Design a protein around this ligand. Sequence first.
Ligand SMILES: O=C(c1cc(=O)[nH]c(=O)[nH]1)N1CCN(c2ccc(Cl)cc2)CC1
Ligand SMILES: O=C(c1cc(=O)[nH]c(=O)[nH]1)N1CCN(c2ccc(Cl)cc2)CC1
Lengths: 306, 306
Amino acid sequence: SGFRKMAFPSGKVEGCMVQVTCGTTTLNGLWLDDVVYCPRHVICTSEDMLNPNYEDLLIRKSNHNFLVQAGNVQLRVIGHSMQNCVLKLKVDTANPKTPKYKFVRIQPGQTFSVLACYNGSPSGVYQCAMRPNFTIKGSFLNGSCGSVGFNIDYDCVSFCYMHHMELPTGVHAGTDLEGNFYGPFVDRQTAQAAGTDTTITVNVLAWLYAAVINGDRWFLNRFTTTLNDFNLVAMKYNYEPLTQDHVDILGPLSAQTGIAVLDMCASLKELLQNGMNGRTILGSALLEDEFTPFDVVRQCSGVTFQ
Amino acid sequence: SGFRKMAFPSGKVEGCMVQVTCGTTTLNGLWLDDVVYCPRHVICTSEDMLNPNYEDLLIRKSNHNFLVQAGNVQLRVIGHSMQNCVLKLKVDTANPKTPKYKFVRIQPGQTFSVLACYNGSPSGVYQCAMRPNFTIKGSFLNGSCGSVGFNIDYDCVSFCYMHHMELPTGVHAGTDLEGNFYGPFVDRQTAQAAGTDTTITVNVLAWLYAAVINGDRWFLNRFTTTLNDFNLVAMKYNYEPLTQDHVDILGPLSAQTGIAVLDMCASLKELLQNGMNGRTILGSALLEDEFTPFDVVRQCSGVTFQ
Ligand SMILES: O=C(c1cc(=O)[nH]c(=O)[nH]1)N1CCN(c2ccc(Cl)cc2)CC1
Ligand SMILES: O=C(c1cc(=O)[nH]c(=O)[nH]1)N1CCN(c2ccc(Cl)cc2)CC1
């Protein structure tokens, strides 16, 4: 028993991290087969960040302007191209530690692990969620650009996030591995702010099920509600509306605890209207929304990986 | 910026995890050079857990009673011995992925990363603290025994914890890698309970500094206090007393924020007496005590590793 913010083991990703330098700027790259992926703003100078024209900036570069280092070994850049907001650097050597992988775009509310890196060197691993406003509440210092986010499906690493920038509110924005931004953000220094965030309701419900599995039961009650009555209360408190698909996703947790979803919704409705009154749930005094139903099952039933 | 529960990258440890089977019982082992380390209760049956005599149980075993598997490869056990509560299995093959390592015993209040494993296969990584009552609030299911806890110092893995059991309150107990239990616990099924836990004060202060670094300032005030006046209030609320050594450890964070330790203590004293009144600090509505001063510096300044 117990419940922790649990990340995926990072070994398979650590062996893909490299350092990429172009001019004065150094950041992190992802080396898979014979391609290194990194944020395209590695080719910008201080004067260019304001209003960069990436097509011009790239045509003025040649392969030898790009220093790629994998630990001590230097990688020779054979070619380069731009795919949306990512630079693809073809190198002479394929990474022998390339895992089975795929590139997937995740949806708001889904979680992944982040391997925070500096100078091509892994520093720490942590779990976070893609927020409904398409930012992540990460922990990143200068030099962390090109750090990646990922999930593991059995033997396969699904890369879903590459870090590009920090917004003025301290939250973080990036792209999928095809270079397409999550959210309405651009890789130029402008006056872009995140829109209004909401609480991920299906995740809060999954976490309440985790609590029940771990012996926290004080918030339960005998009532039941309907989807529409709950959603009426949810909207008032800036909670995402709940759908039938969400109810279905929660099925396995309903089954294991014998507590119907709509039953759990009535507890949630009560917590939203009265608060928690100095009581905690799984060691928290706030409702936690960064565990998916799948995270809970995995941690409260025990799936491993390659 | 940002602040997360950050674990160490686990790659160097993942390559040391093996599966150990003896009879009906399978758990995890740590394979370093030509030795596999695992909990000695792997040699117990159901009848033995009540009152095991490990000397007798071990003399009745031979090397071939021990099945050690590293992925698909089977490891041949050449010898075996007991060191306190750990079994040391000598195998015919030295682990080529053995990192630079050492065995260290940690103190209450220190943090480490846990690589939770099942059947020799890494499942997840998370950060926790050794509590003042010598338990950890982990997340472990059946089969997790032999999972290890570790820190990374530059290139070197410091192993500090091996998981042995879950106590009736849902918290977890184990040994250092020399087989000596943390706390007054024994590896037999008896009526052992954890003693009273306290809050790790120096860690709460470090976390308040992290908050200030990240722009949460609402709890600060102009007052200062003395060590003895603070400790008088701390005792009332089940907080560990604060020493001059703690003040010294917090020095770097005092320097970076310009807020003296005793100044920060007056804020803490206020938070203990009035509460937080619906305000949060770094996204928490409770005072967090599982980040050391070193954790904060590392995350708010950015140290990497091999
Ligand atoms: O390393 C960080 C960084 C990342 C982070 O998440 N937090 C933080 O403090 N620093 N940089 C800030 C964003 N930079 C940038 C943005 C746009 C363009 Cl066009 C060019 C450069 C690169 C450097
Ligand atoms: O895998 C777990 C386990 C670990 C955990 O942390 N949480 C959980 O639910 N299960 N076992 C419970 C403790 N067992 C045991 C204890 C003492 C002796 Cl002498 C022999 C066996 C081994 C099996």
